[PDB]
């Protein structure tokens, strides 16, 4: 077959260089970008049906996720209404449904509970004033999140979601599922548990819940358990029996309607002392400027909430964009969601993002442009102004059970954890660390710790690389580790070391140790012994994988070269990239008799050059 | 001259694998490790003189650095005495002098001031009780630092000091010099400034100092200014006139003795209301168990103090070990200094490490084994029990001026900052970020921020690598970027991309973008266009610099290969390391018709194989 034949001079870097010479309508994305390009002829019907369906779903979803936040039921309607309208303008994706997404809602509610506890606020009981303070805190947090997202989009840093690795995303998702399960379990049991804010909070809440389980409201518990059973049964049947009925069954909406029907008919609120929403505001409240003085106590939480919400939004947007063959602007997504959160925070809402289930409902029933979003917002509006009284008898345990039923996919990742461990240990370590940190910490603090641990794992993987002592395959130019192939011959008096990493400070000490181990000695000690009195003659450093190089790395390389030259041992560098050589020359490496003549193109020119002497 | 001639088959990874088959008396370092091997015949005199000199220096240094900590003068004597005795046993280095090192002392004092403010403690004035509380807090912090150091040495993690990069070390050193200058400027002026704890504290202290400069004690200011002038003048003369008098002149000790002499003779304390130490305990106080309940409020500070103190200790130890041709055990250094800090915290001392100036004094005057340390400790002991009364009239402004005079070398690094910028921008960025963070934050918080900023810079450098579209140098096997050499020919219908970095999540998005830019299109869009209807035929990925690879990287590579195969474009990998191929095979890459036959040894076997078809 084909043969590898090449005849050329032995090029050093100096010789190679001698012979071959070197050397305005986007930030505010218009609705006019697609409204003139609309398809009113046929798209109107699909948009209307899709919007009605996703609005029916999203009213219930926002109502339920308002419990995840520490705000009274009714402000979830505002959170499902306002951001959709103000994302219809600046939004790039045309399939996602803007809403609470209970993970972000639970982060917001954790912040609100921390900044407005039951005992710290009410000393009389002042439900109304406490709810007002909680709403103000949620609005302030939403405004801060929107400001942060707008700043990030303006700075065009949309790649920060790359740092949200799949393992840490999965671990954070499982931990958030556990936290949401604990919160909604507190809600369904109708048990009055004091809120624990800080570290180990979830386990303290579980301890108090299992201590107060004797005070469980039987009616609420049965309602929640039946809602969960019905929802998961219908979801499993849809997953199995999927060839027919392509549109997923909106079981949650029907379950809520029926449960509200019985709650009104038999009046569980008075007869069985059930925990119902009991209050829904009618009409739209006037906008109120949040107190910016609280921004200092929300920074570490607003940052994490913004990052998580934007990551979820872009994830769903990309999932549907690759399906419908279009591209979403990440920085414009940041702009759209930052403006959305600012607008919603001004109008008394908590942080808004997209939800995979709501987006799936919107798309599967005739998914088209964001006009479906406007229709869903209109449905939420008529729910706010008209259907508010009808939803009063509905129990909160039903909403909490709906969220718990939806938690299955989030809980499912512990099954793929062991496969992650079998494939790559560090990825499973990142997963488990993110899960544990987000459990025994805040979800915001857990996310920050998971990101930080991902950075640390990258640094450690770069800092402790694979290094080999290379030898030549006979009659070829192929050099492999001598201990791996058993047909590898060690060259005469010359050791070849491959350090498969960029050289920085941690790598500097690692590389010094690796060279000392490979050559079998250290230049300092032998030089000192020879001075007091008064096996290897060449060391080739295979630097093909040396990506970057810092001042500490250049200083270490110079020190190694000088130390080995002091004992009449020549150090040669091979396979160094052009940019690394530029870094060496601009870091002052080529001073004091270096002259770039000890640099070769591959580790075969070095060996041939040594054989020439 | 020598020529590059090689004849061999074109080996893919599959073909290459087919043809070439693969496959108890240290933790407590005894004084008996060198005491039987001692040289009593001649080493005793050198050790005695060196110990006397360094003890005279270290008594004054500990006395001065006790002001850097928020503890009364006199406990610096204990901090200079006890750790030396308990490091004589477990210590590896035989040249360093154990003591306060005013940077660690200032970190301890910042912690102590934060945890025992003037207004929060005294509400009557209760100098005695406040001093007792400050001493207890310093002892608790020292015990926690010792526990952390002992744990780190037991875990054998002595490489954490590699993460203390030279740029961040220099920036932290300059910021610590600024903080120490501010503190000792507050002391010398004898101005009562309320202590600011937290962020922006140094600038608040400067503002208050310049506001209260009208209340400056003239006698203390003149004493401090004269002490500074004399110390720097003598140091400059020694640096210039250095051929004679090899032993550095101990100007600080003589200056302190003379200043105390005039303070006793003229009684500056009563006549001019000078700020004197005014109190030195006689004898040794009984040991007291620190309250461990304060450990929770010292963790972020104790960790940083332990890391900084250990880093300084090992830095000085290595500097003198490479000079005297011996090796110091890093983990045993951790053990020794952790036991030292535990012992000193039990005996009412603040955190102990080594000082470059004190170690230089000890070594230059007959530096020998740690017996000189024992002699210095004995000198400090006789200062504690006898010379305590003689040092009472000495002003604190003299000690603060001594520290300020020593701050010159620490302040000098702003001179090398611009050269760091010219050599490597990211290293200067690390330097400046560490300096600014340690200025507007705590020194401990500044150190943590600088460390993780170094981690972030490493992650970013790996995440945004140098990538090139390679082409062949004629009649050779040398492939270089087509836009850099101008003699490079693009091969027929095949693009070669070199991604000079390990492939992880941020890198997988970067690599997808790089491939899309290089090939001039994207597989997804062209495949979708062809499906709706119903330039490059090969892409070689030069993966020589791909160091590691995670599950996200393997998934991205599989997706790229599948997407390009969908549009009849073949993707080949070349120069991949053996361990990266093992990672690919254990991550499930070689499934669904991959078969490892698209992997070549270098980027010339791929081109020859393509030319074969
Ligand atoms: C883009 C990159 C990432 C950016 C991340 C930004 C993080 C910003 C943190 C901000 C911060 C540190 C600043 C320095 C940080 C140094 C870090 C060094 C790291 C080195 C590796 C500000 O610190 C000070 O905090 C004071 C309050 O303590 C605050 O208020 C004071 O002045 C007010 C008038 O101004 C006055 O009204 C007020 O009365 C005063 O008290 C001050 O204004 C503020 O300066 C800490 O505050 C954050 O908020 C909370 C505070 O309690 C705290 O909440 C947690 O509570 C749960 C437990 O209960 C916990 O479980 C939750 O998680 C979380 O809800 C957060 O944890 C904390 O973080
Ligand atoms: C190896 C790698 C590094 C390890 C670093 C380890 C750091 C550990 C920090 C410990 C920590 C957070 C724990 C969670 C951190 C999560 C981080 C996630 C990061 C994700 C990327 C504990 O948090 C809680 O703090 C409570 C006090 O607030 C403390 O006391 C409570 O219960 C007691 C009875 O138990 C009871 O007696 C007490 O009355 C209660 O109040 C609790 O016990 C304790 O759990 C925060 O505490 C640390 O100490 C100080 C507190 O004020 C604070 O001091 C700063 O003040 C200056 C301004 O004034 C500032 O300028 C200085 O710098 C610094 O002196 C520190 O800043 C803070 O850090
Ligand atoms: C801190 C450590 C950060 C890196 C950890 C992952 C890494 O690179 O090593 C991993 C080791 O991981 C393990 O052997 C698993 C146990 C490690 C537990 C660490 C807990 C940290 C708290 C590397 O895994 P490997 O290179 O496959 O070996
Ligand atoms: C956060 C950024 C972390 C990495 C920064 C260094 C890096 O790799 O880029 C540096 C850019 O650095 C600059 O151009 C200087 C200005 C950057 C200021 C950053 C402030 C952060 C707060 C990289 O420098 P370069 O690759 O030589 O270009
Ligand atoms: C579609 C589903 C979710 C509708 C749920 C309707 C709720 C309100 C219904 C369904 C089952 C009902 C329970 C069935 C049995 C009992 C026991 C009886 O001694 C008291 C009433 C009580 C406790 C009922 C309360 C109301 C209840 C919980
Ligand atoms: C009992 C209630 C009140 C609290 C616990 C939450 C309940 C409703 C939910 C939360 C997550 C759920 C689990 C999620 C995943 C699976 C795997 C599946 O193959 C069998 C069902 C099973 C095992 C579910 C059982 C029911 C479950 C445990
Ligand atoms: C509310 C509290 C109780 C939640 C606690 C969740 C913790 C304990 C759970 C959540 C996910 C779990 C992990 C999921 C999968 C695996 C792989 C298998 O080899 C068992 C261990 C391990 C690694 C589990 C360890 C325990 C774990 C980290
Ligand atoms: C070790 C390999 C063979 C396990 C293969 C099956 C995996 C996917 C299953 C089998 C049993 C499962 C565990 C069973 C029980 C628990 C406790 C709870 O905290 C959830 C996670 C955890 C820890 C599960 C994690 C996933 C698990 C380990
Ligand atoms: C096809 C293979 C992977 C199936 C393996 C069984 C799976 C479905 C089962 C085995 C054990 C189960 C876990 C057991 C315990 C808990 C704790 C609960 O609070 C949430 C559900 C969770 C986390 C379960 C999730 C589903 C689970 C992981
Ligand atoms: C990868 C890196 C950045 C992760 C860093 C996580 C560190 C800072 C976190 C993770 C878990 C945290 C601990 C969790 C619980 C407690 C108990 C509390 O009474 C004192 C604080 C203490 C002891 C915390 C100290 C800080 C801590 C150790
Ligand atoms: C070797 C050096 C450091 C010795 C320092 C000795 C100190 C105590 C001496 C040296 C110079 C002296 C000052 C010289 C001049 C004056 C002005 C006079 O109107 C009041 C006394 C006062 C303010 C003296 C106070 C004491 C003083 C500050
Ligand atoms: C005036 C006093 C009270 C407060 C300021 C500190 C004084 C004593 C010290 C601290 C650092 C010192 C500087 C450090 C470095 C240099 C560079 C040298 O080539 C000339 C002297 C000079 C410029 C020093 C002058 C004196 C100095 C500014
Ligand atoms: C107590 C307060 C005032 C201390 C403030 C210290 C800050 C402002 C100082 C300390 C060291 C300084 C840096 C040292 C060297 C250089 C290089 C030159 O190109 C000037 C800018 C730059 C980058 C300086 C910027 C300002 C700087 C960061
Ligand atoms: C820019 C190049 C040419 C400068 C070369 C000389 C360098 C070493 C010197 C010249 C002037 C110096 C600056 C002069 C003044 C200040 C203000 C103060 O905060 C100290 C740092 C800083 C910012 C100095 C940093 C170092 C500096 C920039
Ligand atoms: C040989 C070359 C590098 C000499 C350049 C001049 C050097 C010695 C001078 C120029 C400007 C000076 C700085 C000017 C201002 C300050 C602020 C002060 O609070 C500490 C000293 C410090 C930081 C000085 C240190 C010395 C300095 C950097
Ligand atoms: C590389 C990474 C780890 C560095 C992280 C540094 C971050 C967390 C630090 C650096 C400087 C800090 C800020 C410094 C000053 C203030 C003003 C205060 O009123 C509120 C907190 C706030 C706004 C801090 C927030 C946190 C902050 C932005």
Short mmCIF file of C-alpha atoms in Angstrom, two decimals, chain A residues 103-104 107 111 141 145 148-149 152 164 172 298-312 351 442-449 451:
data_model
loop_
_atom_site.label_atom_id
_atom_site.label_comp_id
_atom_site.label_asym_id
_atom_site.label_seq_id
_atom_site.Cartn_x
_atom_site.Cartn_y
_atom_site.Cartn_z
CA UNK A 103 -35.31 25.59 40.28
CA UNK A 104 -34.80 29.33 39.82
CA UNK A 107 -33.39 29.78 44.63
CA UNK A 111 -33.16 34.14 49.23
CA UNK A 141 -33.72 40.03 43.56
CA UNK A 145 -30.71 39.40 38.27
CA UNK A 148 -26.59 41.31 35.95
CA UNK A 149 -27.90 39.55 32.83
CA UNK A 152 -23.30 40.19 30.89
CA UNK A 164 -21.36 24.92 33.40
CA UNK A 172 -26.71 20.61 40.55
CA UNK A 298 -28.14 39.46 47.06
CA UNK A 299 -24.99 39.59 44.91
CA UNK A 300 -23.77 36.01 45.41
CA UNK A 301 -27.35 34.81 44.88
CA UNK A 302 -28.36 37.10 42.02
CA UNK A 303 -25.24 36.13 40.07
CA UNK A 304 -25.93 32.41 40.42
CA UNK A 305 -29.64 32.82 39.65
CA UNK A 306 -28.84 34.83 36.52
CA UNK A 307 -26.29 32.25 35.36
CA UNK A 308 -28.61 29.29 36.00
CA UNK A 309 -31.66 30.91 34.40
CA UNK A 310 -29.71 31.99 31.32
CA UNK A 311 -28.14 28.53 31.01
CA UNK A 312 -31.55 26.85 31.11
CA UNK A 351 -37.00 35.64 38.18
CA UNK A 442 -27.24 27.19 49.23
CA UNK A 443 -28.13 26.30 45.67
CA UNK A 444 -26.38 29.51 44.63
CA UNK A 445 -23.37 28.69 46.80
CA UNK A 446 -23.53 25.12 45.52
CA UNK A 447 -23.42 26.33 41.92
CA UNK A 448 -20.49 28.63 42.67
CA UNK A 449 -18.63 25.80 44.42
CA UNK A 451 -18.01 25.94 38.97
#
